[PDB]
Amino acid sequence: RTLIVTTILEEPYVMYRKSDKPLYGNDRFEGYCLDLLKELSNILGFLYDVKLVPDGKYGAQNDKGEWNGMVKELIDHRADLAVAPLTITYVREKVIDFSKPFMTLGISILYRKGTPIDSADDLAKQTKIEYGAVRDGSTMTFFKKSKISTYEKMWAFMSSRQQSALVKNSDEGIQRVLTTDYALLMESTSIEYVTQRNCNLTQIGGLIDSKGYGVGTPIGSPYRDKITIAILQLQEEGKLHMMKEKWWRG
Amino acid sequence: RTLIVTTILEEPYVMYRKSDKPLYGNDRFEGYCLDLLKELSNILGFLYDVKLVPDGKYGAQNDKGEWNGMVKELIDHRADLAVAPLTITYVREKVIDFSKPFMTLGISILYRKGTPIDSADDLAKQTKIEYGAVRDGSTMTFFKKSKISTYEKMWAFMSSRQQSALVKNSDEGIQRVLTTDYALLMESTSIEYVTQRNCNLTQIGGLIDSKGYGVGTPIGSPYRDKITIAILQLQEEGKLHMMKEKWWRG
Ligand SMILES: O=C(Nn1c(=O)c(=O)[nH]c2cc(C(F)(F)F)c(F)cc21)c1ccccc1O
Ligand SMILES: O=C(Nn1c(=O)c(=O)[nH]c2cc(C(F)(F)F)c(F)cc21)c1ccccc1O
Ligand SMILES: [Cl-]
Ligand SMILES: [Cl-]
């Protein structure tokens, strides 16, 4: 009767709740995706048990085509839903079902206020102002694998000089923006999170690519269509926006 | 054997092709959605006949709950697909099936370069700089129906003084931006189209809300899942981006 929900630790979607006593159930966790799950459970009417994906991965294939991560938990029917910031992608959609996205995002520009810089093309066109992304992440990988001429050119500049314009992780990139003349190309959701906490920083321009986070279900799940309708209901009602404000607020 | 595809005239998605001789079939039409349809037909393997929605409407309900538009063509099985900039919405998803979105968009800010204005909250906070939207459109309707405090406040200012800050249509709003000190809140897709043709105009900040355009199918259609996978394939391949560049280029 109780649905098993696979998720992953990722701020502010899923986090351990602060407490002294050790905790044991769903009370261990908080965040946007926990609130989303609660709202879904009260629209569709279900009990759930949250279980962190044991390998801590979203889901990718190895050289043999074997899956890992939350995707593999779904494939193997060890979870009924994946409620997490799980990106809807071609290779994943072939092996699991996704709801329509509860959040849409893309790459944007994190910079400083008070500049004539107001576009990504306003960077590919010049060299005075430098730019990078987090090493080995989704954004860097976008630029590295791109065949769009303008982003290839931007990858060429980011990876030049021993890739010095890249950074180890998001926390490191934020500090490099805070302490140096540096712009972090990164997901709009993270930029929004950061600007809420740093008033001289802002997002520049719109989204460079587009993607969505959806709820994953095993193929054939009866919950996929139900959850899509529920997400759309929550969106129409403004509740997705309220939840995002609660967890991104600064 | 031939699929009937309902669509709607909407620049640059679906337009009549320039010619002197009268035309008669799919050759009558061009645009982003015609290119999308061609690509879909070559992935999934189908013949199609394009037919403009006779009432020229996307699809809404009247007081009795009766549908019109492309949505009604699908409900009544007078079309097999709707390939058009058809917004995925709660009320529509209950009566037709949608693919995952081939385009995601939202409301943003169309302004001028060279200002410290870099956010929507950078407007709700002040009064010197004014702002509006197209009368009776999706963007104005967002603000009018919103219960988000900041957008309610923004609706209060837009509709003040006999609603003078609103405009009749997008073409009129563009000219009012070109000839006056005026910012048009409008869909990011239209802003992108306009900025490609006006170099002193730019998008300010990111997206205020989020929505997607999807391919509509009658409920139960076998094509829904096929088309979602196909769109994701095209996106992964960069072809959706190439098509958007072709039709938005300036
Ligand atoms: O995309 C990549 N990782 N990744 C997913 O795969 C997913 O499903 N959700 C994700 C959510 C987040 C969040 F922003 F929420 F923190 C994130 F940072 C990464 C995610 C990825 C990673 C390495 C190289 C290429 C990639 O593309
Ligand atoms: O949303 C409204 N109209 N509308 C749809 O309903 C849809 O499905 N697609 C649409 C695509 C476009 C495009 F930008 F492509 F031109 C558009 F301008 C409008 C669209 C709408 C209209 C009046 C009042 C409230 C509304 O919400
Ligand atoms: Cl769906
Ligand atoms: Cl789908």
mmCIF file with all atom_site columns, C-alpha atoms in Angstrom, chain A residues 2-178:
data_model
loop_
_atom_site.group_PDB
_atom_site.id
_atom_site.type_symbol
_atom_site.label_atom_id
_atom_site.label_alt_id
_atom_site.label_comp_id
_atom_site.label_asym_id
_atom_site.label_entity_id
_atom_site.label_seq_id
_atom_site.pdbx_PDB_ins_code
_atom_site.Cartn_x
_atom_site.Cartn_y
_atom_site.Cartn_z
_atom_site.occupancy
_atom_site.B_iso_or_equiv
_atom_site.pdbx_formal_charge
_atom_site.auth_seq_id
_atom_site.auth_comp_id
_atom_site.auth_asym_id
_atom_site.auth_atom_id
_atom_site.pdbx_PDB_model_num
ATOM 1   C CA . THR A 1 2   ? 2.893  2.357  0.683   1.00 0.00 ? 2   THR A CA 1
ATOM 2   C CA . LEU A 1 3   ? 4.771  3.737  -2.314  1.00 0.00 ? 3   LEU A CA 1
ATOM 3   C CA . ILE A 1 4   ? 8.556  3.669  -2.205  1.00 0.00 ? 4   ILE A CA 1
ATOM 4   C CA . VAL A 1 5   ? 9.974  6.979  -3.364  1.00 0.00 ? 5   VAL A CA 1
ATOM 5   C CA . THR A 1 6   ? 13.600 7.156  -4.412  1.00 0.00 ? 6   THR A CA 1
ATOM 6   C CA . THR A 1 7   ? 15.296 10.510 -4.085  1.00 0.00 ? 7   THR A CA 1
ATOM 7   C CA . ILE A 1 8   ? 18.726 12.078 -3.765  1.00 0.00 ? 8   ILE A CA 1
ATOM 8   C CA . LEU A 1 9   ? 20.338 14.631 -1.450  1.00 0.00 ? 9   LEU A CA 1
ATOM 9   C CA . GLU A 1 10  ? 20.515 17.908 -3.396  1.00 0.00 ? 10  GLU A CA 1
ATOM 10  C CA . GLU A 1 11  ? 20.029 21.357 -1.816  1.00 0.00 ? 11  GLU A CA 1
ATOM 11  C CA . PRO A 1 12  ? 17.272 22.747 -1.592  1.00 0.00 ? 12  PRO A CA 1
ATOM 12  C CA . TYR A 1 13  ? 15.284 19.861 -3.071  1.00 0.00 ? 13  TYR A CA 1
ATOM 13  C CA . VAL A 1 14  ? 16.103 17.127 -0.523  1.00 0.00 ? 14  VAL A CA 1
ATOM 14  C CA . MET A 1 15  ? 18.138 17.716 2.642   1.00 0.00 ? 15  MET A CA 1
ATOM 15  C CA . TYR A 1 16  ? 18.555 16.137 6.036   1.00 0.00 ? 16  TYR A CA 1
ATOM 16  C CA . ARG A 1 17  ? 16.560 18.037 8.652   1.00 0.00 ? 17  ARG A CA 1
ATOM 17  C CA . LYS A 1 18  ? 18.538 19.596 11.501  1.00 0.00 ? 18  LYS A CA 1
ATOM 18  C CA . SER A 1 19  ? 18.052 17.778 14.811  1.00 0.00 ? 19  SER A CA 1
ATOM 19  C CA . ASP A 1 20  ? 20.093 16.316 17.669  1.00 0.00 ? 20  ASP A CA 1
ATOM 20  C CA . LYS A 1 21  ? 18.313 13.026 18.283  1.00 0.00 ? 21  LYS A CA 1
ATOM 21  C CA . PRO A 1 22  ? 18.796 10.619 15.349  1.00 0.00 ? 22  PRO A CA 1
ATOM 22  C CA . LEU A 1 23  ? 15.753 10.405 13.095  1.00 0.00 ? 23  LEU A CA 1
ATOM 23  C CA . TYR A 1 24  ? 14.461 7.332  11.263  1.00 0.00 ? 24  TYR A CA 1
ATOM 24  C CA . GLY A 1 25  ? 11.642 7.900  8.724   1.00 0.00 ? 25  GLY A CA 1
ATOM 25  C CA . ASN A 1 26  ? 10.382 10.539 6.308   1.00 0.00 ? 26  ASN A CA 1
ATOM 26  C CA . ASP A 1 27  ? 10.917 13.052 9.184   1.00 0.00 ? 27  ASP A CA 1
ATOM 27  C CA . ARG A 1 28  ? 14.660 12.817 8.453   1.00 0.00 ? 28  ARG A CA 1
ATOM 28  C CA . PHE A 1 29  ? 14.161 14.905 5.299   1.00 0.00 ? 29  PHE A CA 1
ATOM 29  C CA . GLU A 1 30  ? 12.963 18.325 4.154   1.00 0.00 ? 30  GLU A CA 1
ATOM 30  C CA . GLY A 1 31  ? 13.053 20.458 1.054   1.00 0.00 ? 31  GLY A CA 1
ATOM 31  C CA . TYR A 1 32  ? 11.188 21.383 -2.073  1.00 0.00 ? 32  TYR A CA 1
ATOM 32  C CA . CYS A 1 33  ? 10.785 17.794 -3.305  1.00 0.00 ? 33  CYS A CA 1
ATOM 33  C CA . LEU A 1 34  ? 9.505  16.638 0.109   1.00 0.00 ? 34  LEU A CA 1
ATOM 34  C CA . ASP A 1 35  ? 6.892  19.376 -0.020  1.00 0.00 ? 35  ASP A CA 1
ATOM 35  C CA . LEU A 1 36  ? 6.051  18.422 -3.611  1.00 0.00 ? 36  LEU A CA 1
ATOM 36  C CA . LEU A 1 37  ? 5.669  14.799 -2.574  1.00 0.00 ? 37  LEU A CA 1
ATOM 37  C CA . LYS A 1 38  ? 3.383  15.761 0.290   1.00 0.00 ? 38  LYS A CA 1
ATOM 38  C CA . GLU A 1 39  ? 1.191  17.820 -2.044  1.00 0.00 ? 39  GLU A CA 1
ATOM 39  C CA . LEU A 1 40  ? 1.085  15.013 -4.594  1.00 0.00 ? 40  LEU A CA 1
ATOM 40  C CA . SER A 1 41  ? 0.119  12.513 -1.913  1.00 0.00 ? 41  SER A CA 1
ATOM 41  C CA . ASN A 1 42  ? -2.798 14.680 -0.880  1.00 0.00 ? 42  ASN A CA 1
ATOM 42  C CA . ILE A 1 43  ? -4.044 15.175 -4.455  1.00 0.00 ? 43  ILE A CA 1
ATOM 43  C CA . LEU A 1 44  ? -3.684 11.556 -5.591  1.00 0.00 ? 44  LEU A CA 1
ATOM 44  C CA . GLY A 1 45  ? -4.137 9.983  -2.168  1.00 0.00 ? 45  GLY A CA 1
ATOM 45  C CA . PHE A 1 46  ? -1.183 7.758  -1.297  1.00 0.00 ? 46  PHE A CA 1
ATOM 46  C CA . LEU A 1 47  ? 1.169  6.811  1.526   1.00 0.00 ? 47  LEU A CA 1
ATOM 47  C CA . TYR A 1 48  ? 4.878  6.937  0.812   1.00 0.00 ? 48  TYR A CA 1
ATOM 48  C CA . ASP A 1 49  ? 8.249  5.957  2.260   1.00 0.00 ? 49  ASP A CA 1
ATOM 49  C CA . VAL A 1 50  ? 11.247 8.032  1.182   1.00 0.00 ? 50  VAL A CA 1
ATOM 50  C CA . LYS A 1 51  ? 14.451 6.107  0.442   1.00 0.00 ? 51  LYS A CA 1
ATOM 51  C CA . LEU A 1 52  ? 17.678 7.753  -0.686  1.00 0.00 ? 52  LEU A CA 1
ATOM 52  C CA . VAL A 1 53  ? 19.123 6.165  -3.817  1.00 0.00 ? 53  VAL A CA 1
ATOM 53  C CA . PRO A 1 54  ? 21.832 3.901  -2.401  1.00 0.00 ? 54  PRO A CA 1
ATOM 54  C CA . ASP A 1 55  ? 24.577 4.870  -4.899  1.00 0.00 ? 55  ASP A CA 1
ATOM 55  C CA . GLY A 1 56  ? 23.771 8.585  -4.722  1.00 0.00 ? 56  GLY A CA 1
ATOM 56  C CA . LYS A 1 57  ? 23.383 8.901  -8.495  1.00 0.00 ? 57  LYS A CA 1
ATOM 57  C CA . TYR A 1 58  ? 20.679 10.331 -10.706 1.00 0.00 ? 58  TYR A CA 1
ATOM 58  C CA . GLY A 1 59  ? 21.059 7.691  -13.417 1.00 0.00 ? 59  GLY A CA 1
ATOM 59  C CA . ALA A 1 60  ? 23.424 7.064  -16.271 1.00 0.00 ? 60  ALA A CA 1
ATOM 60  C CA . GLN A 1 61  ? 24.591 4.147  -18.401 1.00 0.00 ? 61  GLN A CA 1
ATOM 61  C CA . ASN A 1 62  ? 27.976 2.491  -18.388 1.00 0.00 ? 62  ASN A CA 1
ATOM 62  C CA . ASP A 1 63  ? 29.856 1.114  -21.399 1.00 0.00 ? 63  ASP A CA 1
ATOM 63  C CA . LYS A 1 64  ? 27.604 -1.947 -21.444 1.00 0.00 ? 64  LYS A CA 1
ATOM 64  C CA . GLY A 1 65  ? 24.385 0.101  -21.311 1.00 0.00 ? 65  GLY A CA 1
ATOM 65  C CA . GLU A 1 66  ? 23.751 -0.777 -17.669 1.00 0.00 ? 66  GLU A CA 1
ATOM 66  C CA . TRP A 1 67  ? 21.905 1.880  -15.651 1.00 0.00 ? 67  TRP A CA 1
ATOM 67  C CA . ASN A 1 68  ? 22.673 3.114  -12.129 1.00 0.00 ? 68  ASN A CA 1
ATOM 68  C CA . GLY A 1 69  ? 21.049 5.660  -9.872  1.00 0.00 ? 69  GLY A CA 1
ATOM 69  C CA . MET A 1 70  ? 17.382 6.482  -9.373  1.00 0.00 ? 70  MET A CA 1
ATOM 70  C CA . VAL A 1 71  ? 16.726 5.412  -12.950 1.00 0.00 ? 71  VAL A CA 1
ATOM 71  C CA . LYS A 1 72  ? 17.942 1.897  -12.131 1.00 0.00 ? 72  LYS A CA 1
ATOM 72  C CA . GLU A 1 73  ? 15.821 1.808  -8.955  1.00 0.00 ? 73  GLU A CA 1
ATOM 73  C CA . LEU A 1 74  ? 12.776 2.479  -11.153 1.00 0.00 ? 74  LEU A CA 1
ATOM 74  C CA . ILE A 1 75  ? 13.788 0.028  -13.920 1.00 0.00 ? 75  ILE A CA 1
ATOM 75  C CA . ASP A 1 76  ? 14.173 -2.711 -11.303 1.00 0.00 ? 76  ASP A CA 1
ATOM 76  C CA . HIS A 1 77  ? 10.918 -1.725 -9.564  1.00 0.00 ? 77  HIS A CA 1
ATOM 77  C CA . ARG A 1 78  ? 12.702 -1.104 -6.256  1.00 0.00 ? 78  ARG A CA 1
ATOM 78  C CA . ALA A 1 79  ? 10.957 2.266  -6.195  1.00 0.00 ? 79  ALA A CA 1
ATOM 79  C CA . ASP A 1 80  ? 7.525  3.367  -7.441  1.00 0.00 ? 80  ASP A CA 1
ATOM 80  C CA . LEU A 1 81  ? 8.379  7.058  -7.933  1.00 0.00 ? 81  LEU A CA 1
ATOM 81  C CA . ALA A 1 82  ? 11.482 9.191  -8.189  1.00 0.00 ? 82  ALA A CA 1
ATOM 82  C CA . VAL A 1 83  ? 10.716 12.629 -6.753  1.00 0.00 ? 83  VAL A CA 1
ATOM 83  C CA . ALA A 1 84  ? 13.904 14.548 -7.183  1.00 0.00 ? 84  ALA A CA 1
ATOM 84  C CA . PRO A 1 85  ? 15.451 17.074 -9.579  1.00 0.00 ? 85  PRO A CA 1
ATOM 85  C CA . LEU A 1 86  ? 15.693 14.369 -12.188 1.00 0.00 ? 86  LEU A CA 1
ATOM 86  C CA . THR A 1 87  ? 16.271 15.735 -15.666 1.00 0.00 ? 87  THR A CA 1
ATOM 87  C CA . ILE A 1 88  ? 14.003 14.554 -18.473 1.00 0.00 ? 88  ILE A CA 1
ATOM 88  C CA . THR A 1 89  ? 16.352 13.324 -21.211 1.00 0.00 ? 89  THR A CA 1
ATOM 89  C CA . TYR A 1 90  ? 16.094 11.264 -24.380 1.00 0.00 ? 90  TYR A CA 1
ATOM 90  C CA . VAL A 1 91  ? 18.095 8.289  -23.093 1.00 0.00 ? 91  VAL A CA 1
ATOM 91  C CA . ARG A 1 92  ? 16.163 8.180  -19.811 1.00 0.00 ? 92  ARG A CA 1
ATOM 92  C CA . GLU A 1 93  ? 12.727 8.587  -21.394 1.00 0.00 ? 93  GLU A CA 1
ATOM 93  C CA . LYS A 1 94  ? 13.326 5.413  -23.372 1.00 0.00 ? 94  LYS A CA 1
ATOM 94  C CA . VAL A 1 95  ? 13.639 3.323  -20.190 1.00 0.00 ? 95  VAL A CA 1
ATOM 95  C CA . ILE A 1 96  ? 11.370 5.030  -17.602 1.00 0.00 ? 96  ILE A CA 1
ATOM 96  C CA . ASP A 1 97  ? 8.254  7.202  -17.715 1.00 0.00 ? 97  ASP A CA 1
ATOM 97  C CA . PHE A 1 98  ? 8.410  10.852 -16.724 1.00 0.00 ? 98  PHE A CA 1
ATOM 98  C CA . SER A 1 99  ? 5.677  13.227 -15.678 1.00 0.00 ? 99  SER A CA 1
ATOM 99  C CA . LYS A 1 100 ? 5.616  16.551 -17.348 1.00 0.00 ? 100 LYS A CA 1
ATOM 100 C CA . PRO A 1 101 ? 8.188  18.798 -15.665 1.00 0.00 ? 101 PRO A CA 1
ATOM 101 C CA . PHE A 1 102 ? 7.480  20.328 -12.269 1.00 0.00 ? 102 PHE A CA 1
ATOM 102 C CA . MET A 1 103 ? 10.379 22.705 -12.831 1.00 0.00 ? 103 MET A CA 1
ATOM 103 C CA . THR A 1 104 ? 11.930 24.074 -15.971 1.00 0.00 ? 104 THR A CA 1
ATOM 104 C CA . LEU A 1 105 ? 15.347 25.611 -16.063 1.00 0.00 ? 105 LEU A CA 1
ATOM 105 C CA . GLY A 1 106 ? 18.314 26.207 -18.276 1.00 0.00 ? 106 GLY A CA 1
ATOM 106 C CA . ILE A 1 107 ? 21.768 27.606 -18.429 1.00 0.00 ? 107 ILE A CA 1
ATOM 107 C CA . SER A 1 108 ? 22.108 31.321 -17.776 1.00 0.00 ? 108 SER A CA 1
ATOM 108 C CA . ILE A 1 109 ? 24.753 33.950 -16.913 1.00 0.00 ? 109 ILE A CA 1
ATOM 109 C CA . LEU A 1 110 ? 25.630 34.876 -13.307 1.00 0.00 ? 110 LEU A CA 1
ATOM 110 C CA . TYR A 1 111 ? 27.441 38.221 -13.261 1.00 0.00 ? 111 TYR A CA 1
ATOM 111 C CA . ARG A 1 112 ? 27.440 41.636 -11.533 1.00 0.00 ? 112 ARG A CA 1
ATOM 112 C CA . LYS A 1 113 ? 25.021 44.528 -11.771 1.00 0.00 ? 113 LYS A CA 1
ATOM 113 C CA . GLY A 1 114 ? 26.032 47.694 -13.563 1.00 0.00 ? 114 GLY A CA 1
ATOM 114 C CA . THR A 1 115 ? 27.511 46.358 -16.802 1.00 0.00 ? 115 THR A CA 1
ATOM 115 C CA . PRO A 1 116 ? 26.631 46.619 -20.510 1.00 0.00 ? 116 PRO A CA 1
ATOM 116 C CA . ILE A 1 117 ? 26.853 42.821 -20.595 1.00 0.00 ? 117 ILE A CA 1
ATOM 117 C CA . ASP A 1 118 ? 23.330 41.592 -21.230 1.00 0.00 ? 118 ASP A CA 1
ATOM 118 C CA . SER A 1 119 ? 23.644 38.429 -23.359 1.00 0.00 ? 119 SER A CA 1
ATOM 119 C CA . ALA A 1 120 ? 25.639 35.277 -23.988 1.00 0.00 ? 120 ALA A CA 1
ATOM 120 C CA . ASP A 1 121 ? 26.398 36.553 -27.498 1.00 0.00 ? 121 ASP A CA 1
ATOM 121 C CA . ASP A 1 122 ? 27.696 39.666 -25.717 1.00 0.00 ? 122 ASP A CA 1
ATOM 122 C CA . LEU A 1 123 ? 30.430 37.284 -24.523 1.00 0.00 ? 123 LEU A CA 1
ATOM 123 C CA . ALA A 1 124 ? 31.197 35.080 -27.537 1.00 0.00 ? 124 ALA A CA 1
ATOM 124 C CA . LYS A 1 125 ? 31.790 38.396 -29.382 1.00 0.00 ? 125 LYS A CA 1
ATOM 125 C CA . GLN A 1 126 ? 34.547 39.731 -27.082 1.00 0.00 ? 126 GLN A CA 1
ATOM 126 C CA . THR A 1 127 ? 37.538 38.641 -25.010 1.00 0.00 ? 127 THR A CA 1
ATOM 127 C CA . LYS A 1 128 ? 38.134 41.310 -22.315 1.00 0.00 ? 128 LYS A CA 1
ATOM 128 C CA . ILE A 1 129 ? 35.428 39.761 -20.085 1.00 0.00 ? 129 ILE A CA 1
ATOM 129 C CA . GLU A 1 130 ? 36.107 36.115 -19.196 1.00 0.00 ? 130 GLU A CA 1
ATOM 130 C CA . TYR A 1 131 ? 33.700 33.303 -18.356 1.00 0.00 ? 131 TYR A CA 1
ATOM 131 C CA . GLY A 1 132 ? 33.511 29.694 -17.167 1.00 0.00 ? 132 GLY A CA 1
ATOM 132 C CA . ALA A 1 133 ? 31.443 26.974 -15.548 1.00 0.00 ? 133 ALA A CA 1
ATOM 133 C CA . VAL A 1 134 ? 31.684 24.258 -12.928 1.00 0.00 ? 134 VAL A CA 1
ATOM 134 C CA . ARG A 1 135 ? 34.111 21.503 -13.933 1.00 0.00 ? 135 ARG A CA 1
ATOM 135 C CA . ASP A 1 136 ? 32.578 18.198 -15.023 1.00 0.00 ? 136 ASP A CA 1
ATOM 136 C CA . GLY A 1 137 ? 28.983 19.348 -14.532 1.00 0.00 ? 137 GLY A CA 1
ATOM 137 C CA . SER A 1 138 ? 25.927 19.534 -16.741 1.00 0.00 ? 138 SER A CA 1
ATOM 138 C CA . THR A 1 139 ? 26.708 23.102 -17.893 1.00 0.00 ? 139 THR A CA 1
ATOM 139 C CA . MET A 1 140 ? 30.330 22.461 -18.813 1.00 0.00 ? 140 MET A CA 1
ATOM 140 C CA . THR A 1 141 ? 29.226 19.284 -20.520 1.00 0.00 ? 141 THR A CA 1
ATOM 141 C CA . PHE A 1 142 ? 26.668 21.212 -22.565 1.00 0.00 ? 142 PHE A CA 1
ATOM 142 C CA . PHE A 1 143 ? 29.376 23.507 -23.866 1.00 0.00 ? 143 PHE A CA 1
ATOM 143 C CA . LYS A 1 144 ? 31.874 20.690 -24.430 1.00 0.00 ? 144 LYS A CA 1
ATOM 144 C CA . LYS A 1 145 ? 29.480 18.538 -26.463 1.00 0.00 ? 145 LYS A CA 1
ATOM 145 C CA . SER A 1 146 ? 27.772 21.398 -28.326 1.00 0.00 ? 146 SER A CA 1
ATOM 146 C CA . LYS A 1 147 ? 27.788 21.689 -32.114 1.00 0.00 ? 147 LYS A CA 1
ATOM 147 C CA . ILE A 1 148 ? 26.135 25.113 -32.002 1.00 0.00 ? 148 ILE A CA 1
ATOM 148 C CA . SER A 1 149 ? 28.791 27.399 -33.454 1.00 0.00 ? 149 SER A CA 1
ATOM 149 C CA . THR A 1 150 ? 28.487 30.097 -30.753 1.00 0.00 ? 150 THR A CA 1
ATOM 150 C CA . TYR A 1 151 ? 28.732 27.625 -27.853 1.00 0.00 ? 151 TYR A CA 1
ATOM 151 C CA . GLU A 1 152 ? 31.605 25.704 -29.465 1.00 0.00 ? 152 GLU A CA 1
ATOM 152 C CA . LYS A 1 153 ? 33.441 29.000 -29.625 1.00 0.00 ? 153 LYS A CA 1
ATOM 153 C CA . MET A 1 154 ? 32.534 29.613 -25.992 1.00 0.00 ? 154 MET A CA 1
ATOM 154 C CA . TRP A 1 155 ? 33.778 26.129 -25.044 1.00 0.00 ? 155 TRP A CA 1
ATOM 155 C CA . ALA A 1 156 ? 37.016 26.924 -26.900 1.00 0.00 ? 156 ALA A CA 1
ATOM 156 C CA . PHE A 1 157 ? 37.545 29.982 -24.674 1.00 0.00 ? 157 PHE A CA 1
ATOM 157 C CA . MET A 1 158 ? 36.466 28.298 -21.404 1.00 0.00 ? 158 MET A CA 1
ATOM 158 C CA . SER A 1 159 ? 38.768 25.324 -21.882 1.00 0.00 ? 159 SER A CA 1
ATOM 159 C CA . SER A 1 160 ? 41.736 27.445 -23.020 1.00 0.00 ? 160 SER A CA 1
ATOM 160 C CA . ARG A 1 161 ? 44.770 28.082 -20.786 1.00 0.00 ? 161 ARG A CA 1
ATOM 161 C CA . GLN A 1 162 ? 44.580 24.692 -19.015 1.00 0.00 ? 162 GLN A CA 1
ATOM 162 C CA . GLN A 1 163 ? 40.852 25.209 -18.340 1.00 0.00 ? 163 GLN A CA 1
ATOM 163 C CA . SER A 1 164 ? 41.676 27.770 -15.675 1.00 0.00 ? 164 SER A CA 1
ATOM 164 C CA . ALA A 1 165 ? 38.272 29.462 -16.084 1.00 0.00 ? 165 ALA A CA 1
ATOM 165 C CA . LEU A 1 166 ? 36.466 26.339 -14.846 1.00 0.00 ? 166 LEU A CA 1
ATOM 166 C CA . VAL A 1 167 ? 35.843 25.482 -11.146 1.00 0.00 ? 167 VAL A CA 1
ATOM 167 C CA . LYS A 1 168 ? 35.605 22.340 -8.943  1.00 0.00 ? 168 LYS A CA 1
ATOM 168 C CA . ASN A 1 169 ? 31.993 22.709 -7.732  1.00 0.00 ? 169 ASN A CA 1
ATOM 169 C CA . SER A 1 170 ? 29.116 25.157 -7.363  1.00 0.00 ? 170 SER A CA 1
ATOM 170 C CA . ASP A 1 171 ? 30.168 26.330 -3.860  1.00 0.00 ? 171 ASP A CA 1
ATOM 171 C CA . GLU A 1 172 ? 33.661 27.013 -5.254  1.00 0.00 ? 172 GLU A CA 1
ATOM 172 C CA . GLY A 1 173 ? 32.283 28.859 -8.266  1.00 0.00 ? 173 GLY A CA 1
ATOM 173 C CA . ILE A 1 174 ? 30.082 31.050 -6.069  1.00 0.00 ? 174 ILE A CA 1
ATOM 174 C CA . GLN A 1 175 ? 33.092 32.024 -3.968  1.00 0.00 ? 175 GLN A CA 1
ATOM 175 C CA . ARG A 1 176 ? 35.125 32.680 -7.111  1.00 0.00 ? 176 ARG A CA 1
ATOM 176 C CA . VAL A 1 177 ? 32.342 35.027 -8.243  1.00 0.00 ? 177 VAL A CA 1
ATOM 177 C CA . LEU A 1 178 ? 32.267 36.677 -4.799  1.00 0.00 ? 178 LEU A CA 1
#
